[PDB]
Every structure is written in structure tokens, then in C-alpha cells.
Amino acid sequence: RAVLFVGLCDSGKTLLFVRLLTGQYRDTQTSITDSSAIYKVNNNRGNSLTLIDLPGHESLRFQLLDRFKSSARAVVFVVDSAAFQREVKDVAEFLYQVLIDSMALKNSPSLLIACNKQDIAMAKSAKLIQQQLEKELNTLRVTRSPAQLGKKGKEFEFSQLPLKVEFLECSAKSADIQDLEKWLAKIA
Amino acid sequence: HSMVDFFTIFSKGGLVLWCFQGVSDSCTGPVNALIRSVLLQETHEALTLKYKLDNQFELVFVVGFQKILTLTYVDKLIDDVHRLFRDKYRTEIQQQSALSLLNGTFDFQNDFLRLLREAEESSK
């Protein structure tokens, strides 16, 4: 089945997609449509997954996530770890909709939060990104202008979710995508 | 001077397939193209950046050029480049899988210089 890569513009979805499929680097520009290709997993049986790279632009992100969500075995939400500090709110807001969409599904897809661009010095760790995102989703479920996140009476945390949710670190620039290929293998 | 100072062809998926930026270098961006083609070559000229789409095979052609009034010649260069590119590489681009673009070699430089050198004669 399909693995959807989603995230804000410039989080690195297309470059990861390329790195996973060719092991190489390639110049890219902002994506305006989705792209897909078959990925042969690293494990013995070598199962095949269909990677689908979804544009992060606001005008297209939901239209396309809606179109492909029911076909998803897994969702990889990509995060620019170096720009995280200034983009936190935009990230949390998009992830919120991704969490909701995912839970409202018959067979909830497994979900990964790939903290990308680790090769850049100022990059926040996956541990710190998880912490700040929980704190932020915690405010959003109250301010957000019926499926809901965790329990209303307790501070939000990803573990309270009826979904498999993992965090890992990576870099698309060869690259450092070992953990990501491990996880992809594991969910195939 | 040159009819175009910048030219890049990428898929709508965001994959750059080929780009030109002088017989001098290999595309470092429109800004450097404006610095090298205009600033270091003399109101002064600006660089107009326009695009053309191929919706059937999901391609975007972006060109940067000087002198807004040469737009007709630039537009013809784009059309000729488009027609040739889509024929020479139809196999790599009609496929759905991105691997098809990822594994193709788009060595278009020579066919492009020819079309450029050729379009700069139609202008005269």
C-alpha cells in the first residue's frame, strides 16, 4: 500500500522521496502536483510500497491528502528541523488536521514524524520537536475554531492517541536516512 | 546580448530535469544570472522570469530573459524547446512513475544551444 509524505513547503518531502528511490541528490523546486513511485523495502521478503510525495502548499495540501488518505498504509509527516523554531505553529496546525484525518479512517494508517534536515547545525532534536508539538497541539485543541485529541482533562501527548506514532531524525543531504528506511521496512 | 540568460525544465512534481545558465556555468539561479548577464555587463536591464506548462506530461519551463520586447522570440524558443523536449524524451516523461524521470538522463544542452543559436538568427 501507499505511504504519504506530507509537510509544510520546504520541509524536504521531495528530496527524501528522491533519496529513498535512487540514493542520490537532485535539485528540486516547489511541487505543484503529487508524484509517486514503487519502493522495494530493505527486508528479506522485499515488500513493495507506493511512495506518494504530496505538495505542501496550503492551496493543495488538504485537497490532495483527502484524495489519497484512504489508500494510506502509512503517513510520514516531514519537518524542517532547522526552521522548526519559527515554523512551530504552522507545523502543529497542519499536523493537527493530519492527526484528525488519520483517526477518522477505518484502518488508521501508521504515522511517522520525520525530523529532517538534521545535517544543519541549528537543527532541533526529534525529542525537542515532540515536546514543543505536544505543548502546541495542547493549546490548539482548545483554540481550534466530533473527533478530538486525547483526553480534554489531561495535557495532550501523542501516546494518548489511538494511532501508532513515531518520531525519528534524518537528513536528505550520501544522506542519513537509515532509520527512515528501517521504519518503512517495519511497516511494509 | 543572449536571447535567454536562464532556462530550466522541471516536473510539476518538483524534479529539476535540466537547466541552462550560459555556456559558462550550470544554473546557480536567476539572481546570479541577473548579476552576470546584466550588472557585470555595463536605467539598466531587468530579468523577466516567465513559465510555460505542459499539462499532459506535467512539465514546467521557466525562462529568464532581458528586454521585455523580445518576448515573441523568447516565446518561440520556448515552443521549439518544448516540442523537441517532449519528443526526444517522450518515453521518460509519459510514464506515471517518478522513477522514470529519476532514471532518465536529460542531456539536452547540445539540442538547446542549437535551438538558441538558431532562434537568435530569426530575430535578425
Ligand SMILES: Nc1nc2c(ncn2[C@@H]2O[C@H](COP(=O)(O)OP(=O)(O)OP(=O)(O)O)[C@@H](O)[C@H]2O)c(=O)[nH]1
Ligand atoms: N541541508 C538540507 N537540505 C535539505 C534537506 N531536505 C531537503 N533539503 C533542501 O530543502 C529544499 C526543499 O526541499 P524539497 O524536497 O524540494 O521540499 P518539499 O518539502 O518537497 O517542498 P514542497 O514541494 O514545497 O512541499 C531543497 O533545496 C532541498 O535540497 C535536508 O535534510 N538537509
Ligand SMILES: [Mg+2]
Ligand atoms: Mg516537493
